[PDB]
UniProtKB/Swiss-Prot annotation:
Positions of the catalytic residues: D149 (proton acceptor)
Gene name for this UniProt entry: IGF1R
Post-translational modification Phosphoserine, affected residues: S289, S293
Coiled-coil positions: none
Organism of provenance: Homo sapiens
Residues of the full protein shown: 987 to 1286 of 1367
Cross-link Glycyl lysine isopeptide (Lys-Gly) (interchain with G-Cter in ubiquitin) per UniProt, renumbered positions: K182
Domain Protein kinase intervals: 13-285
The protein's name in its UniProt record: Insulin-like growth factor 1 receptor beta chain
Cytoplasmic side: 1-297
Amino acid sequence: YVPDEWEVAREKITMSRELGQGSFGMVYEGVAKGVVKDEPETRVAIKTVNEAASMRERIEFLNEASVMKEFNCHHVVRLLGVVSQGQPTLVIMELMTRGDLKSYLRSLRPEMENNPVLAPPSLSKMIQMAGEIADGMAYLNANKFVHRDLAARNCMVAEDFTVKIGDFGMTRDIYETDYYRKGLLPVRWMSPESLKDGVFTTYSDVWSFGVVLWEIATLAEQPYQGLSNEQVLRFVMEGGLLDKPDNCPDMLFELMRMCWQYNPKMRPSFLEIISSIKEEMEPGFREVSFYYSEENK
Ligand SMILES: O=C(NCc1nc(Nc2cc(C3CC3)n[nH]2)c2cccn2n1)c1ccc(F)nc1
């Protein structure tokens, strides 16, 4: 691994409580100095590798993390720095206190005790999440990337409830059942063309986005529940679709349906998705989004 402008002296990092498991190891919260301009103390997340990992693994952890270096969008989790000189190997990133979107959605399901409970997210809360996710995705596409694993588990929730495209390749061992080996495919999120030809584009990311909306509307139920992984492949490739979740506003299901057009060319783009809901976005969206930025053509 070649040390970069992203290197941060170990002494500038403080690690406290653990947050949750990542791909190469436990993710911690803590504080960092000089990673967000000249801020002496910024709350950050700290990715680690298990100490008993080889030199090869540590380098692989660092190389994977480096793909994030090119991005700077309000609706994509930011990489802040890297600790590669000596051990433990660290990656410093924007702190998302509310965890992955799949865990956050699952935490909103009623508990089964006799106590009071928050009603499920309103349509406006669901649209705000849809817009922020679509904005991060429109940003990635403008930067010539195909995500290939867009799903609620790969989105993160901030303290203020802002949803962002999360850190890349972190949930394959957290949500094992969301992946199918017979490499590892997230079949319940895949477009018919990706299942048939193994090809992924922004239009297949759009398909997966529709699945993310269905996850939001069901509080992260498993898509195509009652179908096995092989049955999912067959059902989707034959033009089968997910049912409208009970109580899902038709407006929201219609957007899912546009995302699930069998032909990828007939699917809306992420910019097209945002445009259709922009009037419903909180006013700050016009100030922070890629959509309203100078970068959006
Ligand atoms: O890291 C993931 N999950 C573990 C986790 N992380 C939390 N917060 C956090 C991690 C990060 C960046 C990786 C450094 N920022 N904020 C957190 C807060 C509460 C419980 N958890 N559990 C993860 C998951 C999906 C996805 F797409 N990307 C990353």
